[PDB]
């Protein structure tokens, strides 16, 4: 699909509100597998189960291992831009 950029806003105590699968070692992009109700991704709208996360706040995730992506995603704070495409 077309690339979309979605702005999440999260408070300092919460997670992003997604589950992710995939990554370089699995031969597929980082993929959103769940969007958790009431958490930041859900509140933003515009994200979907099945979206690939190509980048977060300008960090390219297209060639990162799963745990590297988890770590980068976990470090984001406040206003967070996701670059996604529905695969």
């Amino acid at each position: 699909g077309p690339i979309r950029k979605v702005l999440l806003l999260k408070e300092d105590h919460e997670g992003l509100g997604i589950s992710i699968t995939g990554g370089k070692e699995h031969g597929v992009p980082i993929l959103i597998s769940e969007i958790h109700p009431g958490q930041p991704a859900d509140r933003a709208g515009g994200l979907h189960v099945g979206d690939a996360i190509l980048a977060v706040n300008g960090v390219n995730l297209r060639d990162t291992k799963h745990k590297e992506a988890v770590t980068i995603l976990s470090q984001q704070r406040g206003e967070i831009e996701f670059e996604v495409v529905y695969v």
Binding site: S19, I20, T21, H26, V70
Partner: peptide, 6 residues
């Protein structure tokens, strides 16, 4: 399956 909540 590898899956992580973040």
């Amino acid at each position: 399956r590898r899956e992580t909540q973040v």
